[PDB]
Each structure stands twice: as C-alpha cells, then as structure tokens.
C-alpha cells in the first residue's frame, strides 16, 4: 500500500507520525574546488576604441575581484544539546593547503585534467576540481599579440564571450565578500549541478548514498558549506565541505505535543502538563537519535534529512513515552504549569487542539463550513475532512498530506494529579522528578 | 601565552580560551550614499528599430526601478540582555535629509567632486558619496544633443555600456524591495570595496581603527546596515550606518561549559550542575563586557568582533567563576538538573566531553584511529593529537588552531552535594542561591 501514518494519544495530548525514512548527516567530506587565474599586467594597450573601452572595463571588474578576494585572506529541549565547530573539517583541509607545495600539487594534478583525487601532506585523500579556466581564456584569447595588442578590438561577440566567463568569478567573490569567506547553503555558482552530481559520484561513499544525494541534490546544497580558502600562484581555491549521509533509510517518527489541562470552571485553579520531548526520532544502531528542535530537519517526501550534531542519543526505550508514559524503564519528560492557554499544534496528518477556558475552538472545512466545535480539553482531528482548525482568533490551515490517523482513546493523565500538591512551576522536569516532589509534600504533612 | 591558549577546569566542567583581542562595536557612524538620477519623460525616439528596441527596454527597466523606490517611501543567559533600536541613528539622519534644503545642500556639495563632509542642520557632520552618476550618463551620451536626442541608434556597444551602468541601480532597488528598505550586511552593490575603503579612511575615527576596519573589511560589512532613505530633486540617497569600533585590542576569553554529573549506576538518581555563564568576555574599562550568545560575535585570527549591545557589563571579579567558583566576592551562575545526558562542547583548542550512563565516548585521530575511551564524567581532550571526538552517535570534528591547553585537575563540585536535598530544578539560579535552599532544607531536618 501507501506510505506514512499517524496516531494521537488522548492521554498525553500528543501524536506521533511514523513511516518516515531517515537521512542523517554523520560526517563531512571535504573536497577542493579550484579556478585558474590569469595574473595579468595592467599595461595591456592603453587604447580608446568603442569596445576596447568595454573590455578594459571588464578587466577591471576581474582584476579587482582577484584583489577583493586576496584582501579576504588575512591572518523546548534544544538547550541540552552541546555544541561543535561546524566547519572545522573543511578549514583544517583549507589550513593544510597553505603548506608549501600542497597547492602546486593540485595545480599539477590538474593541468592535464579537470578532476583528480590527491593526497595532502597529512594523508587525507581529497577530491579536486578545476571549474573555470580564466588563465587560459585571458592569456590565449584576449591578448591578441598578432592582431593587434588589445588596442583596437574587432568583434563584439568577444566582449560578451568574456563577460560571460568572468561573470561566474564576479558572482563568487561577491558571495564571499558578503559572507566572510564562508557560505551555506552552497549556491549554483560555487558548484553547478553538473559539477555537484559529478562530485557526488566520485566521492568515497556507497551507492545507497549516491542515489539519496543525487535525487535530493537541492538538500545537499543546504547541508554544505563553501569555505573560501586560498589564492596564491595562479589558483583560486575554495573548499566545499559536503555532507556524508552515513545512516539512511532507518525508521523515523515525529512527536507532536500540546499542553493538557484540567478543565475546571474557576478562572484559576487549573493544572497543566505538557510533553516536552517534541521532535524527530530516527532509529540509529540500537539507539534513537532525537532531534529536539524539529525545524532544523528538512524533509523531502518521507526522507527526513537531519544533522546528527543537533541530536541527543537515547535508549531505544524512549519510544515508551508514547505508548505508556508512566512505564518503569524510561522516565518521560514534561513541564508543569497553571497557565491553561488555548492553542493548536498541527500534526503530519491532522491537528491537535488544546481548547481551554472561554476560548472558542472549531474545525472548519472548504465546503461544509464549520463541522466541529471542540469542548474544553485536549482533542484531535484528522485532516481527512477538515481543512482548517481555528482556536481563538488564529486560523490554522491543516496539512493536506495523505495517510491514516488513529485516535487512541485514553484518560488524560492530568486527571491523576491531586491539584493541591501538584508542582505548578517545573520548567523541564520529568514524570518521576515530579512524582518525588509529591512523595515529599505528603511527608511534609507531619501533623500534631 | 605567546598567542592563543586554553585551560580546562575539571572541577566545573568548563574551559576558557584566552589570547584573543577585542574589537567591539560601541557606536554608529552614519554616512550618506547618493546616486544621481535623470528624471526623463518616456519618448526616446519611440520608433521600432533593432537596437532602439533594446535601449527602450533598459530605459524602461530604469524608470521602473526609480518609481519602485519612490513607492517604497509612502502614505543560555541572553535573556538578561536588554534591547535597543539598531538603526535609530541612521534613521534619524535619514529623517533630517527630508528637511528643506538639506538635499540640495548635498547636491550642491557634490557637483565639483564625489566625496565631501557636510554639516546637516542639526550640526551632525556627515560623510557623503556619489557612487553612480546616471544623470550625467543619460543626459550627455544617451540623449545626444546635437543630432538628435538619439532617434535610431548606431552602435550596440552603447546598449551594453548602458545596461552595465544601469545594473547597479537595479541590483540596489532589488535588495531594498526585498528587505523593506533596510539591508544588512552591506553588499558589494550598496558599497563597493573601493568605496568602503575610502569611507573608512575619511571617517572621523582613529588610525587604530582605520587599520582594523581596512583589513577586516568583510566583517565591517556584516556590522553595518544600509538604509534606503530619500529620493527627491534628482537625487537618490541611502544612509550607510557603519560601525564605530570604540574598544579595540583589549583581551578576550571564551567560556565554554558543559553539564557536570554524578556517575551513579542507577538509571535515575544522578544530579547535574552546569555553568551558565558561558559566552565571550572582553574587558573594556575595569569591567568585563560579557557576550552571552557567542554568535553575535564573529572571529578573525585572535580578533573577536562583538557588538556591545548584545552585552552585559559585569565587574572584573567575574573571572573568579573560572578560578574558584565558590569565592565570596562574585556569585557564579549555574543551572541544576537531574538530566544526565551525554554530549560534547567543542572548544577553541580542545573538546569537552560529558559522557554519562551507558553512552559510548571515544576520541579518534585521523591516522592512529581511536586513542581514548572516556569514563563516565566530565573530561577534556587537547586538540594536539586528536581530530575527531564521538559522543553517542554524534561525530565532532575538533578545531585545528595551534595553542597550549592546560588541564586543571580538581574534584568536580557536584561530588560535594548531598543529593537527597539538592535542588534538581533551578533553570538559572546561582551558587549561593542553591546553597541557600540547601542550608535551609538541611535545617528543617530537625528533631524533638
């Protein structure tokens, strides 16, 4: 049959969407892109002809862009996450490129041909690429030294042919001059598709990846960096740090949460409880990589491209908070409050609606109009027959992807708490971390 | 030390990296950029010839960009920080150009030459710049005035010469139309390097700065805004609000922190503690400017470009949290938890590894493979012999800067706390503040 599915748990005001397929970035592959430069002398014939003034205008554009580039090289729960340097890998290769001949090694590997693999001084085997040959175009087609010195140019089609080639370089040095020598996502200027697919294919990766990457090439651009590196001899060199999708096609699910309160009629005197583990969950070698800020993940179809360094790694048993939030093994996380406030949280196949107090909560559709008015509490609505959900004054258009949703009838857990001794302010604490503060407040009841 | 250095404190599971050199943005200098406009009536000899069809397109393209601009003007711990208006100065200047003769005063100041200072009506002395002279191109050389305003064009090179001159205005109004009249960083279109280097050099700043700014021109771009301002008489004017680097070259350090836990074997029953005072620190006048989100800041070599308005200013005695977290003078900030979850925090010269529970923590090198397997608790690893570090499923590439790291041995402080009375939930509280809640609960543990 078809693909992705979802279920709502009435008991904990949450839903998970399963049936997705991972695409985790685990490692970084560095590759070196080079552009060959003419290092000309600005005394090419000092003439004033109609189109010689246009070429000389274009050399300027170029000669400045080389120096502009030279001057550039000068010497809930996401808080649990821990931090890294992102492009250390790339820069480290870029830093190795500054040793003595490492650059010429690349010049030489690449004069016979356009692609090459090369071993740097520290052994790392790195893919290199010559994508523009401005040295050859300028030195053997714009210094006409038979006819006649670049003082008097003949055709216009040679003015254009040039500002076409040079255009790429101007758009490159522009992107760097803005972004302090490091760009993401990687534009079509740093790497054209023809180049990026070629590069995908010559990488030290498996076919499982080479397919993933090539079909979702527009994502590969977003998870890559382009680090402007060095420009000495007649070479411009920037490093492109592509991602290594080391785990692929494992199951992924996406956990939705909204707050769950008592529905008492008093203006105050309501208790709230909200599952805090919102986010993505991929299976990753007998443990689950959990991606708490679930926006960073970009999905395409069912494929969930995440970046592992935005993850915790958790026991497989985290998955139990969805089925039995009270179970013994894992200790599911929540956050308490007295702030009974209405909202909806839209799921992959539906919507969750947290409707409280005097707030007005409906579910409308394109044709039948309003087709449900929610009663106070945490409820759910499939995207089958509903297009919008409105809570208060905010309209939510619901997601119109295809798939089966299952309503898991259950007693909301916020009912099991005695509100007189329920810890109203606890901003990331757990199930068990709350059950202790209750075992306590009952002991703190020492009578006469 | 002789350049850059780091020390890891085993006792507070944190590290500071010192030897960096400040460059703070303290103030804003406003400067006026103009482009001169011809304000034509749409009859270029409005006939149907080959190259006349192209010019009329570019005149059209231009006349729109001017109207388009016209229509634009119409009828942890970052939470302590405090908030301001960014472009109040630039906007306030912009508002002053709308007073009566202020524009003609600039116009008049700029027909003899392309730069001049001018005193606006309120005494503020402003640097001005005419960077494109389209009035002059169009009035002399595109409507030739002997024969006959150009009726049916001769050469093609005048079309190109034109859409070259004209690109700049288009690519400028493109940027503004998208970013609603305020862009940052200041692109190569708003101000070319040749210009931004000029403007630095003529600013009312010191040589200490003219040098800093001139070398790190790509960081000055990121710390400037560009405000589209006015378009009256035949003048286009935008204010480029460049930064003023008012403390420069003072020492900076960077405090890295990670969570520090008990390593008991039980699945729950561990206490954690984390230094929250993480982020950059430059000292600037007997006080330490503290930058809690370490990305307001950009680095270049040792130079740490920060923006003082993403800063607290704290007494010098703040550095004691690094030396002796319990001292009386200053009251170091922490955050408690029961959530012992494994992670790394990569530093400037090393890696911190917070490894707990059943989590698998190694440190590899590029060639020898794995060279350390961490035991549960908070440890550190120099970047000397280490290239990657893995915690759970997440791979970290470590920074490859050269510098000396010092591992400062100590009993981790979380070993000193009696966990049956330790506040597991405190989302930003202090050292002394926790020791309060304990000194108390330990008192309520009294007899009869």
């Amino acid at each position: 049959g078809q693909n992705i599915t979802e279920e709502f748990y009435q008991s904990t005001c949450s839903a998970v969407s399963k049936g997705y397929l991972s695409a985790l970035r685990t490692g970084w592959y560095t590759s070196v892109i080079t552009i060959e430069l003419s290092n000309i002398k600005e005394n090419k014939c000092n003439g004033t002809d109609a189109k010689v003034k246009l070429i000389k205008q274009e050399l300027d554009k170029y000669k400045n862009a080389v120096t502009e580039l030279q001057l550039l090289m000068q010497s809930f729960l996401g808080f649990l996450l821990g931090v890294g340097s992102a492009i250390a890998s790339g820069v480290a290769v870029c830093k190795v490129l500054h040793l003595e001949g490492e650059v010429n090694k690349i010049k030489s590997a690449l004069l016979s041909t356009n692609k090459a693999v090369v071993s740097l001084s520290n052994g790392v085997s790195v893919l290199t690429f010559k994508v523009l040959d401005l040295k050859n175009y300028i030195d053997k087609q714009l210094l006409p030294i038979l006819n006649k010195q670049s003082c008097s140019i003949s055709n216009i089609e040679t003015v254009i042919e040039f500002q076409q080639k040079n255009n790429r370089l101007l758009e490159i040095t522009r992107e760097f001059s803005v972004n302090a020598g490091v760009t993401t996502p990687v534009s079509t200027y740093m790497l054209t598709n023809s180049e990026l697919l070629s590069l995908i294919n010559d990488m030290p990766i498996t076919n499982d990846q080479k397919k993933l990457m090539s079909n979702n090439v527009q994502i590969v651009r977003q998870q890559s960096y382009s680090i402007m590196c060095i420009i000495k001899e007649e070479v411009l060199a920037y490093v492109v740090q592509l991602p290594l999708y080391g785990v692929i096609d494992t199951p992924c699910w996406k956990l939705h949460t909204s707050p769950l309160c008592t529905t008492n009629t008093k203006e105050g005197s309501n208790i709230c409880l909200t599952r805090t583990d919102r986010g993505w969950y991929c299976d990753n070698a007998g443990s689950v990589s959990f991606f708490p800020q679930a926006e960073t993940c970009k999905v395409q179809s069912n494929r969930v491209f995440c970046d592992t360094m935005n993850s915790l790694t958790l026991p497989s048993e985290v998955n139990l908070c969805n089925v039995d939030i009270f179970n013994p093994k894992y200790d599911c996380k929540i956050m308490t409050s007295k702030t009974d406030v209405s909202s909806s949280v839209i799921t992959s196949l539906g919507a969750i609606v947290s409707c409280y107090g005097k707030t007005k909560c409906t579910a409308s559709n394109k044709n039948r109009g309003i087709i449900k008015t929610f009663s106070n509490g945490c409820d759910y609505v499939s995207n089958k027959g509903v297009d919008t959900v409105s809570v208060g004054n905010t309209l939510y258009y619901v997601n119109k992807q295809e798939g089966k949703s299952l309503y898991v009838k259950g007693e909301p857990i916020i009912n099991f708490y005695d509100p007189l001794v329920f810890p109203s302010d606890e901003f990331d604490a757990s199930i068990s971390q709350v059950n202790e503060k209750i075992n306590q407040s009952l002991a703190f009841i020492r009578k006469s | 030390g002789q350049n850059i250095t780091e020390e890891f404190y085993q006792s507070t599971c944190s590290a500071v990296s010192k030897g960096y050199l400040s460059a703070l943005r303290t103030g804003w200098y406003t400067s006026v950029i103009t482009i001169e406009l011809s304000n034509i009536k749409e009859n270029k000899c409005n006939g149907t010839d080959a190259k006349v069809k192209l010019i009329k397109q570019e005149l059209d393209k231009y006349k729109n960009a001017v109207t388009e601009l016209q229509l634009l003007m119409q009828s942890f711990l970052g939470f302590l920080l405090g908030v301001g208006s960014a472009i109040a100065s630039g906007v306030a200047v912009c508002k002053v150009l709308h007073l009566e003769g202020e524009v003609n005063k600039i116009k008049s100041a700029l027909l003899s030459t392309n730069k001049a200072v001018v005193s606006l009506s309120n005494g503020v002395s402003v640097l001005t710049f005419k960077v494109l002279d389209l009035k002059n191109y169009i009035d002399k050389q595109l409507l030739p005035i002997l024969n006959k305003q150009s009726c049916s064009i001769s050469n093609i090179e005048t079309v190109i010469e034109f859409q070259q001159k004209n690109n700049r205005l288009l690519e400028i109004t493109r940027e503004f139309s998208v970013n609603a009249g305020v862009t940052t960083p200041v692109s190569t279109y708003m101000l070319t390097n040749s210009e931004l280097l000029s403007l630095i050099n003529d600013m009312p700043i010191t040589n200490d700065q003219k040098k800093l700014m001139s070398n790190n021109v790509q960081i000055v771009r990121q710390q400037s805004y560009s405000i589209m301002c006015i378009i009256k008489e035949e003048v286009l004017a935008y204010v480029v609000q460049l930064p003023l680097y008012g403390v420069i070259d003072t020492p900076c350090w960077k405090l890295h922190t990670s969570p520090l836990c008990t390593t008991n074997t039980k699945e729950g029953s561990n206490i954690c503690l984390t230094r929250t005072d993480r982020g950059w620190y430059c000292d600037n006048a007997g006080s330490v400017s503290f930058f809690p989100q370490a990305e307001t800041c950009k680095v270049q070599s040792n130079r740490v470009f920060c923006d003082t308005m993403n800063s607290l200013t704290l007494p010098s005695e703040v550095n004691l949290c690094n030396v002796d977290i319990f001292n009386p003078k200053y009251d170091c900030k922490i955050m408690t938890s029961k959530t012992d979850v494994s992670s790394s925090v990569i530093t400037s010269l090393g890696a911190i590894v917070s490894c707990y529970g059943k989590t698998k923590c190694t440190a590899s090198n590029k060639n020898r493979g794995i060279i350390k397997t961490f035991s549960n608790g908070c440890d550190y690893v120099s970047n000397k012999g280490v290239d990657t570090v893995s915690v759970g499923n997440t791979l970290y590439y470590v920074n490859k800067q050269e510098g000396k790291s010092l591992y400062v041995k100590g009993e981790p402080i979380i070993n000193f706390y009696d966990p049956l009375v330790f506040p597991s939930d405190e989302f930003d509280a202090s050292i002394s503040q926790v020791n309060e809640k304990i000194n108390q609960s330990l008192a309520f543990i009294r007899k009869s």
Partner: single-chain antibody
Amino acid sequence: EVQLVESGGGLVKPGGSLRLSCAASGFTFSSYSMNWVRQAPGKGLEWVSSISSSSSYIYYADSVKGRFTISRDNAKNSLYLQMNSLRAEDTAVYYCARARATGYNSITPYFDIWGQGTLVTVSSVVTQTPSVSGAPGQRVTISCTGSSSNIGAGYDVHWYQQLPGTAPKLLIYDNNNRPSGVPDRFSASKSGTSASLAITGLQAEDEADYYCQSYDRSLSGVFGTGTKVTVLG
C-alpha cells in the same frame, strides 16, 4: 547473543531455483543494512547483494544481476535471497551479514556480524600476498594493494580472520581499530592505494585465512584474495 542463522541451502540442478533466508536475533533488525556475501569452494570472498535498512536502496554484484533477488521482512526479523537460473559458478557458502559504517572523511561499509553460512552447490579486484609464515613469538605482516578506485579514491580498509572451517570474524575496521574481542597484538595501516595487517607474536589461534576488505566505486565493495598465515615450530 547477537546472532544470524541462515537456511534453505542444499543442492540444486542448473537453470533452477532456491531461496535462502537469514534470520537475525538479539538486535533491532530494521536499523542496519543487510548483505549476502559468498565464498567459493576453496578461496575468495565475494560480495553478492546489499539491501538498505528499509529496502529502498538495493544493489547487486555483476555476477548475479537479473538472476538473484534480495528482500527483507523486518517484521519477521529476516533477510531473503531469491536465486533463479543458477549456474555452476554460484556454488559457495552463502553468508548473511550485518553492515556498519563509521565516517571520518568517508563512508565505506564493513561487516561486524556474520552467520555460519548455508552451503549451496549447483551441479548435475584487490590483491594481497597469498601466503605468510612465521614462528611463534615473531612479527609478520600482510600487504593489501588496491587501485585508483576503492582505496586510492579515498575509501577505507577492513580486515577479517577466518579460521579454517569457520565464518569470517571482523578483525580490523576503519584502518586501525580493534573490535571487542581482538587482542592488541593485531594492528593495521592504510597508505595511498594500499594497506597492511601486522600480527605481533604468533599463536595457535592465529593460523587462519586473512582477508582485507574495502569498497570500490563500481564493484561496490571488494575483498582481498586472501592470505593464509601459518605458524611453525
């Protein structure tokens, strides 16, 4: 026990069929990519077919294209191989294997878990030094030499120890890292287009066939020709 146990092997007449099944147990199957790698009657180890974790990415060696069909039932914790139109070259021990990848500047699978294999008879490259011998206590080394593609194009190297009757066991992964049960005696290298295994102090248990493994961009995963290390006295 993390374990794989194959089944369905026997004898088959050419132009025939037979459907091998590997059942896995003691780990969550759905998370790893599963493989068939087979071994000829007397020597080499050659990769057959690979299947991704959720069955979206599946690939076959040229040897078996259009004839063999790989498949998996994650719900039944099992992996299948559907062989049709068999030939006399297909006779071999068919191993079932768990694949794994650990990425520093490359992602080249290795096999950390093997079954015992089921034998299937049908009737009616990267070179390494073919033999090494040395005395107990001594040091010996095995050279493993590859090409412009695979190792020289930036992939990694792995090593296996196959005692005479047994299944391959993982000996070295990612050039120089030892698994749980491998003594510090064993140590290995990578260089350019080639590798080297180094055994310090020969034992009774060290007498076995040694295969280096790596991944080639077209051949899609490749073993050495094998090295019989023999211990004297």
